[PDB]
Amino acid sequence: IEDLMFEMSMWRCNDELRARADEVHANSRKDAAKHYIEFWKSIPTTEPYRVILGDVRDKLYHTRERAHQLLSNGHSDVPVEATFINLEQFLEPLELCYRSLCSCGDRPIADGSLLDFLRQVSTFGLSLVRLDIRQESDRHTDVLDAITTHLDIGSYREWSEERRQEWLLSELSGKRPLFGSDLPKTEEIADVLDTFHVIAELPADSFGAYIISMATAPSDVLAVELLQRECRVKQPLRVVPLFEKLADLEAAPAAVARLFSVDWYKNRINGKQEVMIGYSDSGKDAGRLSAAWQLYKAQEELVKVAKEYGVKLTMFHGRGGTVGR
Amino acid sequence: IEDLMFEMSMWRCNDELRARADEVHANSRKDAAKHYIEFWKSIPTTEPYRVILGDVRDKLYHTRERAHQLLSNGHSDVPVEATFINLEQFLEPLELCYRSLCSCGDRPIADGSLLDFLRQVSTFGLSLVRLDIRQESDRHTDVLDAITTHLDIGSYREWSEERRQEWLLSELSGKRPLFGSDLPKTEEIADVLDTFHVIAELPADSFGAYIISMATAPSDVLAVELLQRECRVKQPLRVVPLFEKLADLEAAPAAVARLFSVDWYKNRINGKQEVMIGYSDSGKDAGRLSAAWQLYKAQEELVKVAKEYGVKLTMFHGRGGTVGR
Secondary structure, three states: OOOHHHHHHOOOHHHHHHHHHHHHHOOOOOOOOOOOOOOOOOOOOOHHHHHHHHHHHHHHHHHHHHHHHHHHHOOOHHHHHHOOOOOOHHHHHHHHHHHHHHHHOHHHHHHHHHHHHHHHHHHOOOOOOOOOEEEHHHHHHHHHHHHHHHOOOOOOOOOOOOHHHHHHHHHHHHHOOOOOOOOOOHHHHHHHHHHHHHHHHHOOOHEEEEEEOOOOOOHHHHHHHHHHHHHOOOOOOOEEEEOOOHHHHHHHHHHHHHHHOOOOHHHOOOOEEEEEEEEHHHHHHHHHHHHHHHHHHHHHHHHHHHHHHHOOOEEEEOOOOOOOO | OOOHHHHHOOOOOOHHHHHHHHHHHHHOOOOOOOOOOOOOOOOOOOHHHHHHHHHHHHHHHHHHHHHHHHHHHOOOOOOOOOHHHHHHHHHHHHHHHHHHHOOOOOOOHHHHHHHHHHHHHHOOOOOOOOEEEEEEHHHHHHHHHHHHOOOOOOOOOOOOOOOOOHHHHHHHOOOOEEEOOOOOOOOOOOOOOHHHHHHHOHHHHHHEEEEOOOOOOOOHHHHHHHHHHHHOOOOOOOOEEEEOOOHHHHHHHHHHHHHHHOOOOOHHOOEEEEEEOOOHHHHHOHHHHHHHHHHHHHHHHHHHHHHHHHHHHEEEOOOOOOOOO
């Protein structure tokens, strides 16, 4: 950010950027500001881009310090409002600099370090990569079984698919909490519940998708939607089934269609569903030719199903490095 | 405590107090300890009572500083293990000093300032008075009605007594949480719920009884027991109905008997029950003579009920200063 400040030394801007740079210079904090090496003096409004990017430097400094304390210790005293919390609170001032430079005839200047910086922000964001969470369906089934047994309502394991679907729908549409603080948990159950709590405690743009290994029924996905909602996950991450074994690739389209059949889930899915397609295990239990061909057919009929439900299906190909996977 | 330390200057003790004083002198913290005025030097084992009471002084200093910060600010850094948390963590060292003095023939000395201090602790405890909470039943009814309507199960107001008793009982014996973070609350509803949370946050020996104004049915008591358990009140305080209007005193024994008839409540009440008997409003709507006489009848038949259920009844007389109340 400092080198970007060094280049943005023009003196022409729009009235928009003019107004904003005057705003920053109003609350400019007339201080020594000796913690920086360069630009430690209050940046004059003569170079408005430097004023603005100087503020961008301030919020980067405090975001970095906060993330650093949050990581090193368990907490930070840096106010959140002093940092960049949004994926594009960061993006907004740079967008302003770009609009300004283009209006004043400096689109070439805008298409340099500022454009690289725009792209780096909109590609890496506040967290270099969005993180995916993966877990085998059986662990979620263990959780729900614990919850139904402790609620003395039956055993979710022994329940059929139909019954699991009816109960899951009633709780997903219901408004009363499920389990409580006193739910008896195993280290496995506590592992999955705590991963949901960590997902709730951390920023939403820091996570990607929740992948269910050994997924076979709609109950497996709806179980994850329920565990997310129930673990107070503010912005719940998208659920994605993983079909890797030849049996599961064969039966993937039927299961996915059965899931889209649940109107409650298709209405919350927002026209987009991602399903993963593993490549390693198919050619291990069956032939490699048979596995490849079955993968092709699987992709083909998953697309057919999604088209039949008006859902944009994007498939996540679990390809390896070696031809065998 | 400092003057008590100055007086207990004997050198004879039991093997018991000898062992304990030696324990304190092990973790004696050979330091300056200059925050005190007197006895800032490490107390020698020559005077063992001074050792033990010196530790009592340390935990008192940290108790005082902690409560002072807790009151002044919203928090304190003073460790809880450094303070007196129990009603008789405080009493244990003083009890030991008393046993010591009696064993060594110093029962006159023990029956002096140490006995005064013992009685002061065992009478005033860590918080001079236990605080009662009082609230009119209709506010609890408003809360529960909000809870049933938001849960889409009916309206607790409109429900008959029988139904309220069955529902409250099922929730008291059940293990699933009731309301959640997202329960729509009024300033009144939030007032009472927040009073329960405040009761949960504070030490149990700081509170007395939860008195219900305008109490008429067991559902009014059970509503308080439920709201307490549901607001995560670690050690729920006793519930006590307040019968002050003549109509309520006339029907009080029947109502208390109906409450004792609920086995779930009679098993948790632990053979002891407190019920309040108001004097102010009785002589206001009816005659003073009729009110007094009905009060006598009330006490008499409440005792009959308690004896009938094997419960030690203690009655709470809301007497005034003027004969009219």
